[PDB]
Design a protein around this ligand. Structure first.
Ligand SMILES: OC[C@H](O)[C@H]1O[C@H](O[C@H]2[C@H](O)[C@@H]([C@@H](O)CO)OC(O)[C@H]2O)[C@@H](O)[C@@H](O)[C@@H]1O
Ligand SMILES: OC[C@H](O)[C@H]1O[C@H](O[C@H]2[C@H](O)[C@@H]([C@@H](O)CO)O[C@H](O)[C@H]2O)[C@@H](O)[C@@H](O)[C@@H]1O
Ligand SMILES: OC[C@H](O)[C@H]1O[C@H](O)[C@@H](O)[C@@H](O)[C@@H]1O
Ligand SMILES: [Ca+2]
Ligand SMILES: [Ca+2]
Ligand SMILES: [Ca+2]
Ligand SMILES: [Ca+2]
Ligand SMILES: [Ca+2]
Ligand SMILES: [Ca+2]
Ligand SMILES: [Ca+2]
Ligand SMILES: [Ca+2]
Ligand SMILES: [Ca+2]
Lengths: 152, 158, 155
């Protein structure tokens, strides 16, 4: 029992160092292309791509396209869009049923920040969503190229 | 019921936990190297990281502060050399955190404390044009006071 | 008796913190790799995003604590190919035949244990191609070390 008690104390020291070092590296990592909000992390690839390609990049990376579910998350996302000065794609679309936007899971939206008059399915062909530098949303053609931002 | 068995069970758990920590330590060390390549430099307990682009002092300062750090503030020859590596790699002079905006001729850190280290280029600081309150570090590592409105490489320290 | 019990709850608590750290670390690891890195096995490839001549690229990787990309299998080669395709730029590998023409080796001097030469390669075209580049199609080509190619290191 003496040895065990001694080992445990040793582990505490190792863990304290890791937590401290990790805390520092998290800040370093997020600068300047990431944003942490709650338990979510948004990170931009810094370039533009059409929706399908953007979606694949995020999913293959173990995440998904930016999916702001609250005003706080939307503002965090807006910071990256503003930094790059490029509107970005969100993960949501109404490709399945026109007029009904859903997350990749199929769940209906729990938050939205549509610009006045949007979504309007302009030209009868806008199933994707973009977020502007002002944080507002607009449905847009999925074939258009927008800033790639994933969430993890 | 058997104290010996209870101790053995705890031993088993401690061994497993110890394994987890050893694995994490090795994985974290590798990740640190990956993170620092190619825009970061670690010196002592400080880490310098560049954003890869230029901005005027005010915007550069806000970027670093909002990221939870501050503009590069080399406090020794060792830290200066580390920062210089990034400046050289990007071939772009960078802003430091220090200014003499409060009292002309007296440079201080964001906290207000006076410099504990300096590496001024010959003849600097010279407050050229009577309007240079910020500081830039050249690819040769030397410092020069510069107009804060000018754009220089953004490098933060964490 | 009571000691083992107190040590128990102490271990239980510490394990909780480690697993929380493990969870946070796993998340930041994914974030780190997006979009300039690729993990394969215990190896991690990461591109600097810019091109450089061989010597300069090699120094960058070594000074960073790693080495130039050195795919030792089809799986590692495929992972590396992803970064090349994503950046749409051929990249230098670590291997060269600078010591003995026609014989490519890793920085340690060991002979290749895997290769993926494109048709007709290596051909030492021009009479001086001692470095190696990987194309977007994953195939290899010996290239003049003085040429500039995408910098990709492995850690
Ligand atoms: O007196 C003029 C000389 O030609 C002087 O010019 C250079 O020095 C510059 C100095 O580098 C800059 C910077 O300090 C601006 O941030 O300000 C100036 O304009 C001069 O003071 C250099 O050639 C000196 O050797 C020379 O003395
Ligand atoms: O076109 C009629 C009005 O001028 C209308 O124009 C703007 O609205 C446009 C939308 O922004 C746009 C967007 O939804 C595409 O993804 O589709 C359109 O072409 C218009 O609906 C704006 O000035 C409106 O205020 C105005 O009503
Ligand atoms: O580095 C030079 C290249 O190997 C080039 O050499 C020759 O010109 C041919 O074999 C080409 O098909 C090949 O692509
Ligand atoms: Ca539709
Ligand atoms: Ca639609
Ligand atoms: Ca619209
Ligand atoms: Ca002044
Ligand atoms: Ca001044
Ligand atoms: Ca000056
Ligand atoms: Ca040769
Ligand atoms: Ca050759
Ligand atoms: Ca060739």
């Amino acid at each position: 029992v003496a040895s065990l008690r001694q080992q445990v104390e040793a582990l505490q020291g190792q863990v304290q160092h890791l937590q401290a070092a990790f805390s520092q590296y998290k800040k370093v990592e997020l600068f300047p292309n990431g944003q942490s909000v709650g338990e979510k992390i948004f990170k931009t690839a810094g370039f533009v791509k059409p929706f399908t390609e953007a979606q694949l990049l995020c999913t293959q990376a173990g995440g998904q396209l930016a999916s702001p579910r609250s005003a706080a998350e939307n503002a965090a996302l807006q910071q990256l869009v503003v930094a790059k000065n490029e509107a970005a794609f969100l993960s949501m679309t109404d490709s399945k049923t026109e007029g009904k936007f859903t997350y990749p899971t199929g769940e209906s939206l729990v938050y939205s920040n549509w610009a006045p008059g949007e979504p309007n399915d302009d030209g009868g062909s806008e199933d994707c969503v973009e977020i502007f530098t002002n944080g507002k949303w607009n449905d847009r053609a999925c074939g258009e190229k927008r800033l790639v931002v994933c969430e993890f």
